[PDB]
Amino acid sequence: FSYGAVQQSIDSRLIVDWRFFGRTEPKEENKLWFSDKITDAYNMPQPTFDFRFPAGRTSKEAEDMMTDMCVMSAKIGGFLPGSLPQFMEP
């Protein structure tokens, strides 16, 4: 599951991917709900999210996780241009 154009200029044998996954506190306010008006392609109530990563531990850990990936990946090699350290779309 590559996230951008696959590069061809650096030998694939040298390339190592890094994915770090955080945990998220369950919060009442974070919701999946369904429209009473708008429908999806199968004529069913349209899904709608109301979501943010919780403040507090979830957010603190997510940024510490980012740092940890920078620190650990550096032991193997430097970043590949075009695949620099980033949060992925929610």
Add this chain to the structure above:
Amino acid sequence: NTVEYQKNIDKFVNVIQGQLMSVSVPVNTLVVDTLSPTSWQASTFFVRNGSNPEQDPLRNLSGQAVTRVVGGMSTHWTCATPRFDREQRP
């Protein structure tokens, strides 16, 4: 699991992308101001292209997607199956 995909693994991302249908796409507000004067041109950012007017673009899981095929998302998944430790587990 085809011989062809395991000889051309960099092409498998296309199978994944081809069966991830976005759950909730907010109304688009990108400005295109280089249309030809003769082309039909919007006065507002109206509800277009199957977008969901209920969705707040700033409180979304924009990357959430669903797969409608026999086997579900297990026809494309990475196959990683760790146990949860106590801390993560109900």
Add this chain to the structure above:
Amino acid sequence: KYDVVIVGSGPIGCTYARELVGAGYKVAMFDIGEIDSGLKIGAHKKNTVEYQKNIDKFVNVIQGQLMSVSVPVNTLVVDTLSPTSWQASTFFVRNGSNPEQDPLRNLSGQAVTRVVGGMSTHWTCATPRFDREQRPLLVKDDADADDAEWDRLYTKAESYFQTGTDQFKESIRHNLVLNKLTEEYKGQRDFQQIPLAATRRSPTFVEWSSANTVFDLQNRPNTDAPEERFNLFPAVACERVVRNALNSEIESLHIHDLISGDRFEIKADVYVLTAGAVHNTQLLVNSGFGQLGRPNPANPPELLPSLGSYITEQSLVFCQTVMSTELIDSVKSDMTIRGTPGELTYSVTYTPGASTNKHPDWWNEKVKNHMMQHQEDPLPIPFEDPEPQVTTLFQPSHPWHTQIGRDAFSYGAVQQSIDSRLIVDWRFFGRTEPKEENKLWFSDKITDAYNMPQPTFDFRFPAGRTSKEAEDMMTDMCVMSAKIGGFLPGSLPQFMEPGLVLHLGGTHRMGFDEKEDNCCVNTDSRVFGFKNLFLGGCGNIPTAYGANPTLTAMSLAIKSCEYIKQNFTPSPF
């Protein structure tokens, strides 16, 4: 106390200075920007040896002094911030954006330049005349007298700018393109060099004209001009002209000295506003002309109800092409080649004067020398060959201006993989019908960087002829460019962002009668009702035009100066 005060040191303000300082008036000029071009004040920034050796870097100077007029509130979604980062709940008013602006009815590319010399320190120097179809009338009911008057004025403007049509005549690429287009449209269209405000100094250096050419902006008296009186005051923002209670005369100009921070009033006999099509309108609105704030028809303006309405901006289409194989081969049609490049025996020859040759001897000599001296190079065009500067001017059957060549104002990353000698730019400029509904107005709440009412556009290209022509113009550029070569990937045919062209007109438009012609100044560029207030620049131009407007604006300024000299007496020295 001055005889005349001029707001703005661009080429139109310098027209007024040239004429009035020369006529013995005591003149002051203010500019909100600063001296920026070297010791030649207000000169073209491209006239350095370094820029003419590195012309692809000049786009940076242009971009560095185009400050966007009206930027709508941004609504781009960034959803990959870290959870710890401060995150917006709304698309609030950020980064100096203008909340009044509808992003869909903008001239997003419109920009202004605040430097001594104005936009003439970076402009392309193209100075065509308008034909009758594009030009406001200066004489009613007498087409020959109107023609003779505009000829007189344009001739004088051409002298001030040092306009010529021959500076590129020794370019191979220029004449290659020119001749092919002449042959292809034989007896349907005429091609010539773009008329250019410039003087060639050497085969590799062109002294491009500017405001400095028109008037050198040195204070006077000085040794070269001992009986003249001129003072330039840079870093001075001019904010308002004060009207008498009769609205018959301006009594002072209120200024903000940007270096001390202090505000002052300046008295003169005559006031001239040459701050540009946007900033003249801003100053006037700030002075109680027109209407401040979002247009509201239920509240008719007291003065100049047409100010800021009927605005015009040109449609612009662009592409670049890579020269055809056939055209390249034709460059070397007169050569005989023996042997193989790089060997002792290699020989490229031609017979000078030979009646079968397609090209003149000077061309043939250049090509021969290039091929013998650079036997590793695969093209016949010399490395220092100047660019094309080609036009077919606006005509009823092709009602757009055209510039075909190499322009320093590149619109994207400059490519390096295709040889620059093969590349030809195409820019076609449409005319736009003046319509009341198309407006430049100024916020009564939001202010700009100089604490003045924030400019806001309400603009669309008119339906009907304007829109039909703009799309026909696009097609015409595709059809014509194909005669020279195919499109360069990365520069495919496209409309440019509205206003990028910077040919805005009609913001303080000219005509014979304020009411009947929906206008702000008369044909002496005098503001209706006011004895001593004159406006100069493209804002005056009331017509739909496709050609570049500056020469026309200067011609009107010349005529306005004739009026001034005939009606106001200079102080004794």
Add this chain to the structure above:
Amino acid sequence: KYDVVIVGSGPIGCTYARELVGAGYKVAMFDIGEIDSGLKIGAHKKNTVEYQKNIDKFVNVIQGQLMSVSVPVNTLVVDTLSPTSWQASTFFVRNGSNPEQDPLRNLSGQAVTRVVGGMSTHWTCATPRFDREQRPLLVKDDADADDAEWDRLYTKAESYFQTGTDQFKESIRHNLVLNKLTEEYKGQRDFQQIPLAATRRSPTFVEWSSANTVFDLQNRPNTDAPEERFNLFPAVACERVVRNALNSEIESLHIHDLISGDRFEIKADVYVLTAGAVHNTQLLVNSGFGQLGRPNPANPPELLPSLGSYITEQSLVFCQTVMSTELIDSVKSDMTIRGTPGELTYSVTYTPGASTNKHPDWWNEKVKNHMMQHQEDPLPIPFEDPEPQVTTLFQPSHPWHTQIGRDAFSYGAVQQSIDSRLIVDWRFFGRTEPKEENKLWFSDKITDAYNMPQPTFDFRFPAGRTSKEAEDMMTDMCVMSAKIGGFLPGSLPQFMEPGLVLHLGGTHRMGFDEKEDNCCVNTDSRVFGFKNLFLGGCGNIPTAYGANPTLTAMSLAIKSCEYIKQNFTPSPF
């Protein structure tokens, strides 16, 4: 005939002018570029009111005067040309590219600036001292005497540049970042303002220093300096110094006047080359020092065999962050808020002097006023609050320089969707071991735009410490930046193109003994063997350094001038 001739009008050349014109020498200075900064000759281009109101446009001025040193032949494949377009069969030498250059062993970002004032007309003004670890010795075997000598020199250099550490002390954002980093590294690292060659004139205007600050470049004698003798000659390319047959003395400087085209010889008692780290080396090689052409060890140079070897350039890493929610909320920690924004009842208050307040009253007043006056704005930081200017200087345990704030030299499209007040830039600069194999050399075939031998690099970051530190530096920037906020998408942590940093050293390096220390100039910056030839600039610096080098180079120039004044007598006036 002059007493002293200086090649280059950058800040190091102006150091020589300042010292020697002041000491009563008859001085000429040549610059290949032209006067470009307004009436203050050689001044900082960012000192206009317009640029300080539109700082995001200044990157264009920088880019417009960085001309790439060595561009390898391009091999990008364009396969979507029209069949009719002329099409290459090979990747031939196009567009001024350098066929000598290995694209994989380049400093592709290295660039040069040819304007009066040199790169000081655009620079950031950061002027840190080097600590012992980064600094060449000026006194052997006596660390205290070495420290005292560098202190003396740096103190004088700081006065010439008007270096200070307090210009940003009234910025909220500055102190927010500064204080958080101090707290987070409590007793492991020290933070302070970046020392900056600048003087604040108002809360919204900073007069940034430049070559003009060091010496105003006005010709002399003049009314302010009636007994001084100085002439500046712009648009003059200096091409060679002529050696006597003994290689003990320079006899003339050969120049090319770019405006007439003519060549001349200039005689002086003393010759100083301050053309920059690249162009000093070019001129010297063109003059028979070092070795012309691709290095060939089998042909040992006659003179200065170390010239062009041991070159150093810094690794540079960069990112931007978006301020944390926690830091933003902390700005308004002392406020009590009642009511809701936008209503008649809304009230933001603090108690001045209250001992429980976290911030001084001036901060609290600013925040109170912003929140009450802009109740639609969601942030507590005032709109005109200046940027951070934060550093933790190089130390053995973190051997890189750091600049944390807002830099006018943006590296990509400037984003508009995140509020600029939230954005903080991070630049970490590594030191590079000097290695014989790392070279700047000059082609014996290919020439540049001024008809001089074409510069070519052969460079890689050394294996071992340099490379280990550069990657540790990257990590350190990730770790430290995270304390302030997460990364800005579009500006994620990255190494910058080699040489973009423009901190090139060691090209004509300094030391005590030509042979033992593999060097070109001694500690008076005198070229070994030559009584009257001196070199100034970062090319002198022989050490591995991470901090910005200009202050150090100026300090060496000061010392060189002491030598000159002690050994050459000025002509009588």
